Amino acid sequence: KVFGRCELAAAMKRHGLDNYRGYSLGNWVCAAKFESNFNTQATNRNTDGSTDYGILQINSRWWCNDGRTPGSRNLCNIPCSALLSSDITASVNCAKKIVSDGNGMNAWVAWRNRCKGTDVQAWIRGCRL
Ligand SMILES: [Cl-]
Ligand SMILES: [Cl-]
Ligand SMILES: [Cl-]
């Protein structure tokens, strides 16, 4: 599924991301836009052989099992294909564990390089929330 901007904002709010560990909703929408262009089916392979999955580009080296990343962990306890669902639940729940790990949203490279320190409230402007 390719979400609209406000549709995803609403979905993320309903799932408890607004101010989760102090990160306002617009941070999460901005991260999703630049990680996946709001497409739940997005995948990208990394140089190390791991792959990033779904709307928040969650990586198989640590967080999910794809059966092809040797030596990796599955800290979210989920197949990576669950992260590609039209239902963002699994992605959201795994993202909460990532953002709690110590480095906050700096785990998301696109967030660090394109969202951090910008006016992220712009991403939720006009939405009914
Ligand atoms: Cl915001
Ligand atoms: Cl893994
Ligand atoms: Cl933080």
Curated annotation (Swiss-Prot):
Tissue: In the egg white and polymorphonuclear leukocytes.
Record keywords, A-Z: Allergen, Antimicrobial, Bacteriolytic enzyme, Disulfide bond, Glycosidase, Hydrolase, Secreted, Signal
EC number: 3.2.1.17
Domain C-type lysozyme as annotated: residue spans: 1-129
UniProt xrefs under SMART domains: LYZ1 (SM00263)
Protein's GO biological process: cell wall macromolecule catabolic process; defense response to bacterium; defense response to Gram-negative bacterium; defense response to Gram-positive bacterium; killing of cells of another organism
Pfam families reported for this sequence: Lys
Catalytic residues (UniProt): 35, 52
SUPFAM superfamilies named among the record's database cross-references: Lysozyme-like
Catalyzed reactions: Hydrolysis of (1->4)-beta-linkages between N-acetylmuramic acid and N-acetyl-D-glucosamine residues in a peptidoglycan and between N-acetyl-D-glucosamine residues in chitodextrins
MF annotations from Gene Ontology: beta-N-acetylglucosaminidase activity; identical protein binding; lysozyme activity
Disulfide partners: 6-127, 30-115, 64-80, 76-94
GO cellular component terms given for this protein: cytoplasm; endoplasmic reticulum; extracellular space
Entry binding sites for substrate: 101
Domain of life: Eukaryota
Location of the protein in the cell: Secreted
Entries under InterPro entries matching the protein: Glyco_hydro_22, Glyco_hydro_22_CS, Glyco_hydro_22_lys, Lysozyme-like_dom_sf
Biological role stated in the UniProt entry: Lysozymes have primarily a bacteriolytic function; those in tissues and body fluids are associated with the monocyte-macrophage system and enhance the activity of immunoagents. Has bacteriolytic activity against M.luteus.
Assembly description: Monomer.
Note: Lysozyme C is capable of both hydrolysis and transglycosylation; it also shows a slight esterase activity. It acts rapidly on both peptide-substituted and unsubstituted peptidoglycan, and slowly on chitin oligosaccharides.
UniProt family annotation: Belongs to the glycosyl hydrolase 22 family.
Record's protein name: Lysozyme C
Organism: Gallus gallus (Chicken)
